Amino acid sequence: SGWTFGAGAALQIPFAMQMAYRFNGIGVTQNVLYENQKLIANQFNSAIG
Amino acid sequence: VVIGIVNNTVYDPLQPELDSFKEELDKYFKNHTSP
Amino acid sequence: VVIGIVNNTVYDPLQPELDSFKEELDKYFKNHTSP
Numbered sequence: 725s726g727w728t729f730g731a732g733a734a735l736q737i738p739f740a741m742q743m744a745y746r747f748n749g750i751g752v753t754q755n756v757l758y759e760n761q762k763l764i765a766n767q768f769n770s771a772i773g
Numbered sequence: 774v775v776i777g778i779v780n781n782t783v784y785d786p787l788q789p790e791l792d793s794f795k796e797e798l799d800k801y802f803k804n805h806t807s808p
Numbered sequence: 809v810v811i812g813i814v815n816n817t818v819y820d821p822l823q824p825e826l827d828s829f830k831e832e833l834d835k836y837f838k839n840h841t842s843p
């Protein structure tokens with residue numbers, strides 16, 4: 725549910741759409757997530773490793 | 774390229790604002806058959 | 809007024825959407841020479 729459970733009741737969102745909202749938050753347009761989603765996920769999975 | 778993309782129409786507000794101007798243009802020809 | 813401004817074209821997406829409508833308009837006249 726991303727930030728929504730902090731401000732009210734938890735509202736579900738797909739996790740890749742949560743990451744798109746984040747990307748807009750850092751000033752990178754949300755298409756840069758969806759055009760690279762498998763890489764962004766592989767980078768995150770490697771970083772957690 | 775995008776995972777989970779869906780098919781839907783995207784409307785263009787410039788299009789009927791062009792197309793009702795085609796119907797204006799076309800009525801000028803259809804009448805100007807006559808003089 | 810602006811220090812370091814540079815000369816380049818700015819494209820207008822409304823312009824070929826008007827101009828291909830000029831080529832539609834113009835073909836109506838070029839054919840309507842004939843009837």
Ligand SMILES: *[C@@H]1O[C@H](CO)[C@@H](O[C@@H]2O[C@H](CO)[C@@H](O[C@H]3O[C@H](CO)[C@@H](O)[C@H](O)[C@@H]3O)[C@H](O)[C@H]2NC(C)=O)[C@H](O)[C@H]1NC(C)=O
Nearest residue numbers: 738740758759761774775776777778779780781782783784
């Ligand atoms: C979203 O809309 C797409 C565009 O209409 C649509 O693409 C079309 O999908 C079908 C099935 O894959 C294709 O049909 C052809 O399939 C094979 C070749 O792959 C041929 O042997 C068949 O005879 C037939 O012609 C269409 O060609 C294809 N259209 C385009 C422009 O590529 C998607 O399937 C839609 N997806 C969803 C989930 O709604």
Ligand SMILES: *[C@@H]1O[C@H](CO)[C@@H](O[C@@H]2O[C@H](CO)[C@@H](O[C@H]3O[C@H](CO)[C@@H](O)[C@H](O)[C@@H]3O)[C@H](O)[C@H]2NC(C)=O)[C@H](O)[C@H]1NC(C)=O
Nearest residue numbers: 809810811812813814815816817818819820821822823824
């Ligand atoms: C950016 O583009 C500008 C527009 O094309 C261009 O302006 C033009 O600059 C020249 C040189 O200053 C002028 O040429 C005239 O110069 C004197 C008058 O100042 C006359 O005696 C000459 O015979 C000649 O006509 C142009 O008149 C001027 N155009 C306009 C519309 O003002 C800039 O120079 C370009 N700058 C860069 C760095 O690319």
Ligand SMILES: *[C@@H]1O[C@H](CO)[C@@H](O)[C@H](O)[C@H]1NC(C)=O
Nearest residue numbers: 800801802803804805807808
């Ligand atoms: C047809 O053309 C005449 C001018 O010749 C104009 O007065 C009239 O309003 C036109 N009618 C239509 C239906 O366009």
Ligand SMILES: *[C@@H]1O[C@H](CO)[C@@H](O)[C@H](O)[C@H]1NC(C)=O
Nearest residue numbers: 835836837838839840842843
């Ligand atoms: C010319 O005008 C006729 C109607 O009189 C139309 O059927 C035909 O499609 C037109 N052809 C072209 C090339 O515009």
